[PDB]
Design a protein around this ligand. Sequence first.
Ligand SMILES: *[C@@H]1O[C@H](CO)[C@@H](O)[C@H](O)[C@H]1NC(C)=O
Ligand SMILES: [Ca+2]
Length: 496
Amino acid sequence: QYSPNTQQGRTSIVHLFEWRWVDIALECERYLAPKGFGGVQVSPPNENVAIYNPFRPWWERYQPVSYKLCTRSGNEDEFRNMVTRCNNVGVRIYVDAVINHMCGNAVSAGTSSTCGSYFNPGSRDFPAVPYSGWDFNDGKCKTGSGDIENYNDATQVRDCRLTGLLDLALEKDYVRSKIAEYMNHLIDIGVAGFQLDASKHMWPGDIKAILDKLHNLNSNWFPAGSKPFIYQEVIDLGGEPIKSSDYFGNGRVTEFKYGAKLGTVIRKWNGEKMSYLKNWGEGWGFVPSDRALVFVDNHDNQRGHGAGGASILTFWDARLYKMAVGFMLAHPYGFTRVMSSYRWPRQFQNGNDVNDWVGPPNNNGVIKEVTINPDTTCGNDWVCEHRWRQIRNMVIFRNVVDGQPFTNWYDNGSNQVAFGRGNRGFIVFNNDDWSFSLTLQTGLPAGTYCDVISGDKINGNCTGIKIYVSDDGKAHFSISNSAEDPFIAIHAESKL
Ligand SMILES: *[C@@H]1O[C@H](CO)[C@@H](O)[C@H](O)[C@H]1NC(C)=O
Ligand SMILES: [Ca+2]
């Protein structure tokens, strides 16, 4: 459960938030594979509730109605097609598994679902699964409202409804089998792993029982005995009775402290500085690197919908975001997940965005296709951060330095730091309000290297900044606090 099952050489996965299966299949062949991406995290592929008030919000996909591969992203055929095409090109697929609950208890009964399946939240009836009142822990929850009221009580956090969402009785073998049946269907189709959504709201023991019912990966693409990659979405910022270490026996865990702290440091909040990132990782109280799934932002907290708060950096903070993602991709800690979003009409009223529910670009509810512009960027409101030169090139940077140790650290006691990865890579950052100009030891072989942030290595030449490393590995770096991108990165594969 701890290995991503990515092809040797690929070290990152990208979350193609709300993308259609057909668009992802194309992206796998035309960009992800050639650019060295390891895999893709997809939005929940199972039938969810269709909400028209607000109009088709992004969170409607977190309210399951059944386990039918029928959503706004596509049907089972298109989904199968996407997994096959991506797998055939070396790009894995990871599914966001929503197994802690079903839809809201206050949702209207009827056929307002993405595939027409009938459901009755009030009577706890989900015939398409099927599930009934006996499969929920309404009689197990001990709070007066039936919802989670206090997170200081690990019990109610697991047996009660998360903001009204009907809570599945995961201790029952029947429920465990129905969920495994859904996950095994996906595994036999070709998916390499899963993201267990709302894992904090499930008992580590119940998760284990389910995982024990899962098949090995499809022997047509993976070696015999391959187990699905598992990363549990646990929001643990400390101070709670529930700890993400309690889930180590099931697989990896999402480290939400990673993005939150990285945001405050890059933003220079609370007097924090980049020079403090010297012992970044476990030294900061994070989970062990071999159990961590890291990211700068996620679909939740990028819209103030998740842990991290106002410190979280997103595509809206383009300049600082690129630097944050760059540091993450260059640093050896954990397995990295890159975010890919869409734009929405942010509208802050009282310091709050009242349009944080807006779903993906669409035409009367039908998700718009991902169009590629002549400059490789995207249109139709898709941000496509994974296509940004600075991010795409750093994804490759991580692949090239995979396995290399962290060394040659340098910092000016403020916000000007630099470090390398063995003898395969070097990166420099300038987040101070003044220019940076100094000769640093890169530990790199002599030669001329192309800066992969400002440019590219094309046809035995660089389109951006060029760095000259001497015989003793020293090189001069010059970064003005006015540069579009305040950081420079070079590696073995960007050498001329
Ligand atoms: C690099 O570009 C210049 C023209 O700008 C040209 O003289 C040179 O041959 C190019 N080098 C290679 C290896 O193509
Ligand atoms: Ca629960």
